Design a protein around this ligand. Structure first.
Ligand code: SF4
Ligand code: SF4
Ligand code: SF4
Ligand code: SF4
Ligand code: FCO
Ligand code: FCO
Ligand code: F3S
Ligand code: F3S
Ligand SMILES: [Cl-]
Ligand SMILES: [Cl-]
Ligand SMILES: [Mg+2]
Ligand SMILES: [Mg+2]
Ligand SMILES: [Mg+2]
Ligand SMILES: [Mg+2]
Ligand code: NI
Lengths: 268, 551, 551, 268
């Protein structure tokens, strides 16, 4: 049978959001591209290059008009008329707005496209902004994290394919199955927080008993996500806090890349 | 004279444009251009030194881990901190497993479709393809039944009419030399590679807390809590789980990746005679094993004018000769200050004025070593290890040459390694040697915990006044990496990254000298200037990373 | 002539003793004995009906899931509760995936070493072994390279002098008939089987909460919370993960287990002419798909005197014909009350007095159906499906017969299925058909959630006065299972389990009639009475479970 | 290279403690028996039967006297002179006491051998007791659960092989890495317990949001174990509470098989 089409464009990306797919198991990246979708444009994996791959993109935008999912990783730089990211001699903001015109659904994968992320931090050298800021007339589905667990993306695409609509979203257009709860309101170290059992430095006695990381700067009290339950890499038991390091707030605008690692979170 | 542009170059990390002048079907001159900038050096300035590693790790998600590890080494250098040996063993296992994933994905997912014609694989006889590998490999998944299953997946994709990322490829090009059977073998191995690289990243995840972008480092060591008898920490059960994934990597690396490297060389022997980028090579030693940030398992060094017999060894990440020689220029880059700059005195002031052939044409800076252009990465790393007389490296190269000699009747000399295929060979040799690094460092960690050492972290102090400087070196998958930090009144006053793809991809320098990508393309034959596959073959051998090169 | 004892029987679940009189080189008379009792029916008495399933699941950890599901079905029967359809889909996926693990482990880990000589595999030519499977299997792990790796693992075990559980085996016995090459194929498949059964149990774990011993059931439905949009519950990501494991089972089952079953029959064709245990067979329908505990995907029935053409169908777990026929006797068992008992009126009063050939000799009771001895399990199941004219079962049996025909030039008729090898074939046919049950029930669950039905649980009420009787039927891996609960004044006043290995392994009954194990052994040739391999071959074909038989 | 010898004896077992090994990944059962140990006696997997396998047990107890690890699953019945479990015509208590005399280390795998478990519950029809009760002069290592995660057993055996002694034990001789903490003192639903967010029935709105299971009968507050952290089957996210069902207390004497599913736990 025919497979649902996808167009993937990278703006000011590090490629970590594409690389998340190479850790996925349900589906694996080979089953995603041979069975689940038709990946019509993706510069990291494409056999074609240069003029051939730009022709392939134009052909797919015409053939699949009103049908494809558009995915963007990385921030979009507006300073100096778009010149901080140029592909085929044109500002990436122009490639993204052209591709958005015919999209059935639009997804910002990662903190950079969802809210500006690391590339928009500090002084913001390039005037980097979010995908929603460049497409004010469109509903952008945000899948934040640096990078997210790849299944936060893959189960969102599967809901669009299988049931013909997006998953339920919060007021930041994030899927509720993945972002509907604070990490601290579903964390297995909450008993230690409640008892005042805290690690004070890495390698101290409390740290070596798996105690709460709040006083090392854990941002779980102010970050929405599924890192304590879904976790990462499908091996069991693997997320930052379980390994021994505080959450940094990478999902959440104003927390990750703004607050210091050891700065304390506000608690509701 | 014809002028071509390749924009975008695909099957790399990030945003690259290549321009070529072609005279009578031969490249006469080339330009490399990084077309995206973020300003990561400016984003990390004016912060606490302890926070840099979490921010600058986001320079790149393909070479994840590498900028995190270089950043904590740079702060430890500035502050004069000696890292606990258990923190070294854990950092080393992460970097070796990550690099295994990186090299496998580069050979198969990024480079193989330059050399392999998927449509030709549909004409293959699966039984003849299997018979070709008898006495060449002991791999367990080279049967006719495996190859038939893979052929049927290609048949079903073509029949659908939806080729997607396999569409409008270079199928039938005159530079495609493999027979149908070898194209089918290569597609089977491309799919099998995706399982091996997933197991490598399961090693990284169990120590790092996730991948991409690990979260277990600190200025002063690691955040893993070692306690064999603890619930919820790094105990014997967790270490046993790590070992179960380390053990799954060797067979594919040795019986598939190493063999396919020899086979591609046997079918493409003119690619041993082109793609030379430089005559000088640099690598740093890697995998420290003592209590004082030294005693490396892999050696480093500097080769000048291709002379292995007179190279200069580098055994310390504090080597003053290495430190003093490194500079970068922006004469042909989109930055304001153009004279060569030592990185502790570096600036990154954007000055975009559009493309000029003789002026500025890239966001990449131009690095030099005592005023010379230098190639970094697996070809440099392999040549330095051969100059050191490392038996493990000579023996691994000799295993690749024995397979090549069985297929062709010819040997390989060291002069033939200064080439597009020599660069690919150096990357495979590295991936093979890293499996013994993993076994060695897992055993070291188990033994050291057994002696009663559970230490992982030295808490830093950072003086609130004064100005002091540090540098962190690391041998990354693409070559020598360095992060340069200046601290003033307790915060970062300067931060400069000099990254391996900066050395190789940078544009013409302050003396208009040509760097490795641009020099490698001179002489390249181009059969069809509308479809310049031969140019992309040589550029892909360097494993370009433009998020890395530009940051 | 002489008397032998086989104690313990290994490669079964639990504690079994087999005695045989041998006359003129053949077994003339046999005794089966279960030698361990716990009293699980007494342990669960006087409890709340809702608690029983968590206690009685521990009757057996090999057939985990089965006693849990039969217990909740018995309470639902007594209480008149209709189970939500989503709860039926979840219970059905768990049973089908568990049964796949159970059958694979029985054929390879428990039975293969009755037919396979591991020493003989050291003499094999791995290339000739691989060539033997061209055109009978498409499996991707039958290469000479795979078989050489497996041969080297055997060689290393033997060279260590520590054979452990592989030692003092039946190596060189005259009833061992496979060539060296076929022994080596079987050991390779034994090791590959362990990966397939592990994937089957990952399906069970994701719905059950763990395995062994699932924890997701309730009287009234299941504890899984269906919410596609919920964090921490059964959402679309968790359902996609379940599907990824369901999809990994088919290739091994169809291309390895199904083909090995036909190959063993081709080398051991006299084992189609011995090991008949009974002339009457019973199975219950399984995998309900409606809102009222019915509409089964697999049919049930009763066959009398081996006549498929006049069988009696069973389409309901409330069938009064099936309920009224079942009794158990303890005349030749170590219990006090000896006359045949309907299980709602059953007792289990221990009365151990030691072994007597003509008195009591087992902890297993003797079940009858309207006064007749009956065989249950995969041979019963298959023969009932063929009596029903089920085309899926016809077609799957024909695929095994076609491989047998290609290897021997001979065919297989239904009369030859009443035998030790027919029992093994029925088990393989069941495992193959269960892969379509898993695809069917996964699709049914996705589709029903899409219609807006998320219901999973109906909370029960239990009247505090009155006496209520319920029965829960289940077609378990070893055959028809039934749990019989009487509720009086709100608590369990009687609990009786009648388990498939009770039917097959039970001793001589109230009329001194012989049950299936003891009947099947009459006529067995025994070449060496000190090493009675031929007796253990027929007994293993029943898949004994003595924790199940006795409880 | 010689492998450390192991003798495994089943008493009143259901075989679920042996079946746990078939779900293990580090090591898998095939790597366990070919590389990690020499399994000298195990009736579920042995090629030999009857007189041959009892000859092999005798030879092994003599060859490896003072060197082997003895493992028992199931309770040991003492009523009526031991006749409720008879192997080769003799009470299992006599086979176990004979094998204990030459053991280097002795492990009770599962709640039945650790404390009597389900087989000693209710009126205890067979006078079932624990392995430590039949071996009063010996130190028995207890690995409870019904069955435990197989790695609670495999990492205990690995500590004995690699470092030459047992892991650190609590006052019930349970390894601290697996049994050192209450499930409720490291449970990811503790935030919901603290806020009074409880499931009242399976399938209700709070149950379908992943709320605390205390009011369904969860025994986490009175059960020591690693079920919330190590979990089960190495797939990620799989333990009873995560699937939607309360803990029943199967690890803990006096809790599992004694208290009703829906009976409330005492909270410390
Ligand atoms: S969200 Fe993080 S991983 Fe994804 S592009 Fe941005 S920096 Fe890279
Ligand atoms: S502060 Fe962090 S480690 Fe502590 S309970 Fe909250 S989310 Fe968990
Ligand atoms: S502890 Fe549980 S799984 Fe193990 S033998 Fe006892 S009842 Fe069976
Ligand atoms: S009662 Fe149970 S579900 Fe609730 S927090 Fe405690 S252990 Fe977790
Ligand atoms: N490897 C890698 Fe990335 C580049 N170039 C870095 O450092
Ligand atoms: N299958 C199985 Fe166990 C037995 N006999 C049950 O029921
Ligand atoms: S740093 Fe990011 S990955 Fe999760 S644990 Fe915190 S939101
Ligand atoms: S019932 Fe047992 S398996 Fe763990 S969750 Fe509770 S101790
Ligand atoms: Cl320790
Ligand atoms: Cl729903
Ligand atoms: Mg220093
Ligand atoms: Mg720089
Ligand atoms: Mg209701
Ligand atoms: Mg009974
Ligand atoms: Ni990079």
């Amino acid at each position: 049978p025919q497979r649902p089409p996808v167009i993937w464009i990278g703006a000011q990306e590090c490629t970590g959001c594409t690389e998340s797919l190479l850790r996925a198991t349900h589906p694996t990246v080979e089953n995603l591209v041979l069975e689940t979708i038709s990946l019509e444009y993706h510069e990291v994996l494409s056999a074609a290059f240069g003029h051939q791959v730009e022709e392939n993109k134009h052909n797919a935008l015409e053939k699949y008009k009103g049908q494809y999912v558009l995915v963007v990783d990385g921030s979009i730089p507006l300073k100096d008329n778009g010149i901080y990211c140029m592909v085929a001699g044109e500002p990436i903001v122009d490639h993204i707005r052209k591709a958005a015109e015919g999209a059935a659904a639009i997804i910002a994968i990662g903190s950079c496209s969802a809210w500006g992320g690391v590339a928009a931090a500090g002084v913001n050298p390039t005037g980097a902004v979010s995908l929603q800021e460049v497409l004010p007339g469109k509903t952008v589905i945000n899948i934040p994290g640096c990078p997210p667990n790849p299944h936060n993306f893959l189960a969102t695409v599967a809901h669009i394919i299988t049931y013909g609509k997006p998953p339920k979203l919060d007021d930041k257009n994030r899927p509720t199955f993945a972002y509907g709860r604070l990490i601290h309101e579903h964390c297995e170290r909450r008993p230690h927080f409640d008892a005042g059992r805290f690690a004070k430095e890495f390698g101290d006695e409390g740290h070596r008993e798996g105690w709460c990381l709040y006083h090392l700067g854990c941002k779980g009290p102010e970050t929405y996500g599924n890192c304590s339950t879904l976790q990462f890499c499908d091996v069991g038991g693997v997320w930052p806090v379980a390994i021994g390091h505080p959450c940094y707030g990478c999902n959440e605008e104003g927390i990750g890349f703004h607050k210091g690692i050891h700065q304390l979170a506000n608690v509701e | 004279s014809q002028r071509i542009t390749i924009d975008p170059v695909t099957r790399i990390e990030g945003h690259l444009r290549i321009d070529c002048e072609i005279e009578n079907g031969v490249v006469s001159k080339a330009w490399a251009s990084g077309t995206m900038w973020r300003g990561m050096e400016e984003i990390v300035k004016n912060r606490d030194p302890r926070d840099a590693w979490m921010i600058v790790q986001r320079i790149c998600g393909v070479c994840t881990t590498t900028h995190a590890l270089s950043s904590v080494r740079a702060a430890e250098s500035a502050l004069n901190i000696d890292v606990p040996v258990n923190a070294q063993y854990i950092r080393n296992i992460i970097l070796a497993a990550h690099t295994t994933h990186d090299h496998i994905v580069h050979f198969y997912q990024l480079s193989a479709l330059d050399w392999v014609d998927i449509t030709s694989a549909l004409q293959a006889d699966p039984t003849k393809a299997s018979e070709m590998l008898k006495g060449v490999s002991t791999w367990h998944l080279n049967s006719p039944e495996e190859f038939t299953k893979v052929q049927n997946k290609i048949k079903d994709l073509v029949a659908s009419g939806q080729l997607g990322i396999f569409a409008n490829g270079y199928w039938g090009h005159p530079a495609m030399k493999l027979p149908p059977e070898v194209n089918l073998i290569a597609v089977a191995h491309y799919l099998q590679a995706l399982e091996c690289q997933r197991d490598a990243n399961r090693v990284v995840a169990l120590l790092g807390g996730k991948t991409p972008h690990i979260q277990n480092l600190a200025v002063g060591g690691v955040a893993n809590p070692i306690n064999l008898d603890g619930l919820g920490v790094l105990n014997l059960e967790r270490l046993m789980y790590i070992k179960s994934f380390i053990d799954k990597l060797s067979d594919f690396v040795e019986q598939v990746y190493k063999v396919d490297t020899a086979v591609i060389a046997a079918f493409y022997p003119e690619w041993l005679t082109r793609g030379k980028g430089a005559v000088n090579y640099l690598s740093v030693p890697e995998f420290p094993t003592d209590s004082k940030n030294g005693s490396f398992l892999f050696p480093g060094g500097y080769i000048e004018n291709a002379d292995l017999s007179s190279y200069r060894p580098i055994t310390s990440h504090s080597d003053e000769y290495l430190i003093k020689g490194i500079q970068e220029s922006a004469k042909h880059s989109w930055y304001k200050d153009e004279a060569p700059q030592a990185p502790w005195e570096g600036t990154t002031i954007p000055a975009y004025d559009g493309w000029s052939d003789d002026g500025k044409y890239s966001w990449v800076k131009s690095p030099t070593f005592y005023g010379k252009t230098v190639e970094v990465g697996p070809l440099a790393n392999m040549l330095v290890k051969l100059a050191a007389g490392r038996e493990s490296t000579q023996n691994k190269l000799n295993e690749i040459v024995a397979i090549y000699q069985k297929l062709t009747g010819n040997t390989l000399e060291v002069a033939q390694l200064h080439s597009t295929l020599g660069r690919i060979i150096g990357r495979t040799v590295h991936c093979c040697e890293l499996q013994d690094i993993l076994q060695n460092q897992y055993s070291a960690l188990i033994t050291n915990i057994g002696k009663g050492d559970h230490t992982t972290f030295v808490k830093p102090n950072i003086p609130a006044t004064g100005e002091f400087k540090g540098v962190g070196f690391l041998e990354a998958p693409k070559g020598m990496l360095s992060h340069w930090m200046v601290i003033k009144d307790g915060i970062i006053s300067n931060y400069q990254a000099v990254v391996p793809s900066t050395w190789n991809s940078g544009p013409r320098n302050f003396n208009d000298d040509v760097g490795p990508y641009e020099q490698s393309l001179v002489g390249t034959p181009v059969a069809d200037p509308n479809k310049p596959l031969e140019v992309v073959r040589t550029i892909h051998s360097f494993d370009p990373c433009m998020a890395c090169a530009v940051h």
